[PDB]
Amino acid sequence: KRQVASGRAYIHASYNNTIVTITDPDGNPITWSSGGVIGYKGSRKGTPYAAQLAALDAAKKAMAYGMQSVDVIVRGTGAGREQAIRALQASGLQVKSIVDDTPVPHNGCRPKKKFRKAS
Amino acid sequence: PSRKAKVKATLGEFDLRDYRNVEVLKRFLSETGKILPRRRTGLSGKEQRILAKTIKRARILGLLPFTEKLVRK
Amino acid sequence: ARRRRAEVRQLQPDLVYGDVLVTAFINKIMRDGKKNLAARIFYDACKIIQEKTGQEPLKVFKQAVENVKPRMEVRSRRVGGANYQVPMEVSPRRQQSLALRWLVQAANQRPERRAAVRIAHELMDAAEGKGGAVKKKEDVERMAEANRAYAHYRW
């Protein structure tokens, strides 16, 4: 209930869950969805299907604020990130562009054991 | 394969030491602020080693990026 | 079947409709190789589909099979610990085997004392979209598409 139309869609994939946040031309979120927002509670939350549903839920809800066109921004890798980038393209919203902006350090903090054994 | 074109050949006689030639330096950067490997820069161990310092110097001055976002995906 | 891809036994068409699919169904009714009693039952039934139904039996039959063929089914699978039920298509071949089998099964699940009738009535119900046969079919699809989350284990 503002009527935006043009905006951004942040897809935050991960090996545990996917969460999409839609925003206005300059960052402030309009609506957000995830694997939890919808049914799924544990492992299920990750799965590409969930990512899909969540993507859609995100668009549908954003359709209300009158959204139409969006720029997609993918962050991270995980259980079905592409499905999300697809459910959007189909959701109805015209996807203006998909862009990987997954953060990466130029080597700063020692990661937790679980993510070390590398170099 | 990486047989598209050596950045070196696709260019003139430049001073690898010059840290302000944004024009040419920008040529050795990936589709991100990343410095290309010799495989693609067509430079040599020594040349390529001098580029790095130059491309890094240029980054501090703000002329060259440290990293750019990827489009498509 | 480790070596070949075991080809399908081709059946001799019906001795009345010259339809192979029919022989198949008759073979699924048969038990202890008493193929005569089996053939009879299916024909007596076809004549029960003629009376109580002004339609040609053969078309009622094929119609039935059609509604009873599942198009998606769930197949178990071990994936990291638990045994997730992966949903997937059903071969054209397997669709038939299941359809016919299910019909005869549900048919023999009916009450009417006469074998030939249970088949007659089951087929019809199946055509209309009702009956124990179509139950299982719709139950299967329901099972899949309800586990359509683990479908990324495509198989």
Next chain:
RNA sequence: GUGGGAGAGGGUGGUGGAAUUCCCGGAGUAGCGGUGAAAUGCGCAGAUACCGGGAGGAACGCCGAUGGCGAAGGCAGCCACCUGGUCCACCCGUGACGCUGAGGCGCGAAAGCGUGGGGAGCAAACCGGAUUAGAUACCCGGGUAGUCCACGCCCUAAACGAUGCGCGCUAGGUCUCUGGGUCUCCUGGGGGCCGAAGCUAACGCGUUAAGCGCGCCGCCUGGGGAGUACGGCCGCAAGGC
């Protein structure tokens, strides 16, 4: 000596951007997180996801190598200063000034110790969740010392090429780093691979020797008891020799 050169060699000061955490503002709801599944945990005092601002600590993506430097330990953002080693060309100067080296002295990863500072992330101990027959573990959530700095101490290691240093001599082939040249290759120094002769128990080594020789140092003498006991020396202690 003169002249060319390469380098994460060392020390001091400065400084750049990415990311994490925290804090502030904005917009925004109902979950986030995590696993084999879970739970603890966090979140309506509004978390997660998103935008902007700030503070702080630690590390330095790509380049990056199959690479380079150092005696070893070890050393990688960029900048300047201070500083070590080392190669090549010219053959110009001294004229055996050489080699090795018990003891000495110095350096010596990590952990650890003392005083003070710092503390974002990580994380012994510890506190919880789960798994299990039990779980003093592996997995998950927290978390102190510590990890960072300074000054002092400790002196160990699979401190490894498991191969002491120097010199001479003994087919080549191939890739590579760095210098010279008459620069489709020759020549010098370094890093790899394959291999002559030869060596080796074999594996393998083979101009970067584990080959053929000489000089000097260190070390071994069946296994366990045992790197223990005792004594001595060193250390604040743990402990070391």
